[PDB]
Amino acid sequence: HGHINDIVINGVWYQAYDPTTFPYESNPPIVVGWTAADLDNGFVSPDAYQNPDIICHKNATNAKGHASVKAGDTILFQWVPVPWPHPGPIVDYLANCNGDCETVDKTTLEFFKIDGVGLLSGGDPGTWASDVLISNNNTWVVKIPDNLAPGNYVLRHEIIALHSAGQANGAQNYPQCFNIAVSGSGSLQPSGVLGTDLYHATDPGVLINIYTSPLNYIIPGPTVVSGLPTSVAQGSSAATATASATVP
Numbered sequence: 001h002g003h004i005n006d007i008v009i010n011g012v013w014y015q016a017y018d019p020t021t022f023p024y025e026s027n028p029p030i031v032v033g034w035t036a037a038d039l040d041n042g043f044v045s046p047d048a049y050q051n052p053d054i055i056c057h058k059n060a061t062n063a064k065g066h067a068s069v070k071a072g073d074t075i076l077f078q079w080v081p082v083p084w085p086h087p088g089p090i091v092d093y094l095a096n097c098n099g100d101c102e103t104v105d106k107t108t109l110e111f112f113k114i115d116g117v118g119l120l121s122g123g124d125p126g127t128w129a130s131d132v133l134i135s136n137n138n139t140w141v142v143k144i145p146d147n148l149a150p151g152n153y154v155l156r157h158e159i160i161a162l163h164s165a166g167q168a169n170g171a172q173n174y175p176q177c178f179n180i181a182v183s184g185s186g187s188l189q190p191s192g193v194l195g196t197d198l199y200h201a202t203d204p205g206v207l208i209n210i211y212t213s214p215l216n217y218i219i220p221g222p223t224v225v226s227g228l229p230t231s232v233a234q235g236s237s238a239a240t241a242t243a244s245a246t247v248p
């Protein structure tokens, strides 16, 4: 259980959507994170993998502004509370909004995977991407590909928790969506997968007992786009300035 508090893009801090705070406010701010109904810091289960909730979390509605970034920039995700409690993989996707992300229909977004880390070593439980996130003060770093075509994209970051995944419907997915506007020199525009086609309840990395050794792990979802590292070097860094979500 947790949620993202902020993202830091080359040192520039943005307030994320806070489902533990904003729903209680009269007039919550416009932010780069989508509005969602994870007030309990909870998850989407496999029985909702074919439901709109898996796209950007429960009942999600579009963030009403965006963060402008350059292709090649790195984005740090800050999860709270510290520490994240569960073992599992971490993945990141982009989907072109084909227009403003503030008004895109989320059910049309076709996600391509830009990073994904699973089981790093061992078993029962082993060391996972989540352990790296915990070590780095509850952060994960993704790089927007240097050659990504200019456009507006939803960035879908997700931790999957596997401590209860040995049973049907036991995996727990924690997607978090953000609006970005990307500038750059490249033309990369990878083939994506609809959110409700990403995962199935019987996938080998979804229905899995991690309390066994030796252990292997197939990260769910499509391949990381060719030519991208499956992760860039992890490590937390501080923000040096703050910005607000830019409205169209």
Ligand SMILES: *[C@@H]1O[C@H](CO)[C@@H](O)[C@H](O)[C@H]1NC(C)=O
Pocket: 037, 038, 058, 059
């Ligand atoms: C999501 O929306 C549905 C439809 O209105 C509602 O019944 C449900 O309570 C909402 N979920 C949460 C967690 O608020």
Ligand SMILES: *[C@@H]1O[C@H](CO)[C@@H](O)[C@H](O)[C@H]1NC(C)=O
Pocket: 005, 078, 079, 080, 082, 137, 138
């Ligand atoms: C670790 O991250 C949490 C959540 O953002 C923050 O409250 C805390 O100050 C961070 N630790 C340091 C040393 O910055």
Ligand SMILES: *[C@H]1O[C@H](CO)[C@@H](O)[C@H](O)[C@@H]1O
Pocket: 008, 009, 010, 011, 012, 074, 075, 076, 141, 235, 236, 237, 238, 239
């Ligand atoms: C510090 O470094 C991290 C890792 O590159 C960035 O994500 C962050 O925005 C800041 O520049």
Ligand SMILES: *[C@H]1O[C@H](CO)[C@@H](O)[C@H](O)[C@@H]1O
Pocket: 191, 192, 193, 194, 222, 223
């Ligand atoms: C490009 O590749 C993706 C899978 O990675 C497909 O979902 C898409 O239809 C296209 O063939």
Ligand SMILES: *[C@H]1O[C@H](CO)[C@@H](O)[C@H](O)[C@@H]1O
Pocket: 050, 051, 052, 107, 194, 195, 196, 197
């Ligand atoms: C996944 O499921 C959704 C319905 O929840 C469809 O809109 C989508 O095309 C895909 O089949």
Ligand SMILES: *[C@H]1O[C@H](CO)[C@@H](O)[C@H](O)[C@@H]1O
Pocket: 200, 201, 202, 203
């Ligand atoms: C797990 O197995 C089911 C069939 O039992 C498939 O539909 C699913 O795509 C996954 O391969």
Ligand SMILES: *[C@H]1O[C@H](CO)[C@@H](O)[C@H](O)[C@@H]1O
Pocket: 211, 212, 213, 214, 215, 216
């Ligand atoms: C638990 O399951 C793993 C397979 O993931 C085996 O390698 C191990 O021997 C035990 O049966």
Ligand SMILES: *[C@H]1O[C@H](CO)[C@@H](O)[C@H](O)[C@@H]1O
Pocket: 122, 123, 124, 212, 213, 214, 215
């Ligand atoms: C889990 O434990 C098994 C015991 O055989 C090891 O082989 C494996 O490398 C992992 O540590």
Ligand SMILES: *[C@H]1O[C@H](CO)[C@@H](O)[C@H](O)[C@@H]1O
Pocket: 190, 191, 222, 223, 224, 225, 226
């Ligand atoms: C991941 O990589 C495979 C092979 O390059 C593609 O077919 C897929 O569409 C995704 O980019």
Ligand SMILES: *[C@H]1O[C@H](CO)[C@@H](O)[C@H](O)[C@@H]1O
Pocket: 226, 227
């Ligand atoms: C995947 O495909 C790309 C594009 O051809 C290569 O750059 C990469 O080395 C891998 O074969």
Ligand SMILES: *[C@H]1O[C@H](CO)[C@@H](O)[C@H](O)[C@@H]1O
Pocket: 116, 117, 118, 229, 230, 231
């Ligand atoms: C992403 O995945 C690849 C292939 O499993 C690793 O080699 C890389 O270090 C990262 O974990």
Ligand SMILES: *[C@H]1O[C@H](CO)[C@@H](O)[C@H](O)[C@@H]1O
Pocket: 117, 120, 129, 132, 230, 231, 232, 233, 234
């Ligand atoms: C991306 O990050 C993962 C987790 O630290 C590493 O295992 C990988 O080699 C790459 O640096």
Ligand SMILES: *[C@H]1O[C@H](CO)[C@@H](O)[C@H](O)[C@@H]1O
Pocket: 078, 136, 137, 138, 139, 235, 236, 237, 238, 239
């Ligand atoms: C990651 O951790 C560092 C401290 O090591 C913080 O400065 C940063 O804000 C993030 O929480």
Ligand SMILES: *[C@H]1O[C@H](CO)[C@@H](O)[C@H](O)[C@@H]1O
Pocket: 010, 011, 012, 239, 240, 241
């Ligand atoms: C604060 O300073 C850092 C390091 O100079 C920058 O990365 C950031 O964009 C802001 O200017």
Ligand SMILES: *[C@H]1O[C@H](CO)[C@@H](O)[C@H](O)[C@@H]1O
Pocket: 013, 239, 240, 241, 242, 243
């Ligand atoms: C801008 O303000 C944010 C919070 O609004 C900080 O976290 C950041 O360090 C900078 O002072």
Ligand SMILES: *[C@H]1O[C@H](CO)[C@@H](O)[C@H](O)[C@@H]1O
Pocket: 029, 030, 243, 244, 245
């Ligand atoms: C940019 O705009 C947002 C929304 O009004 C503020 O939360 C932020 O402090 C800055 O003024």
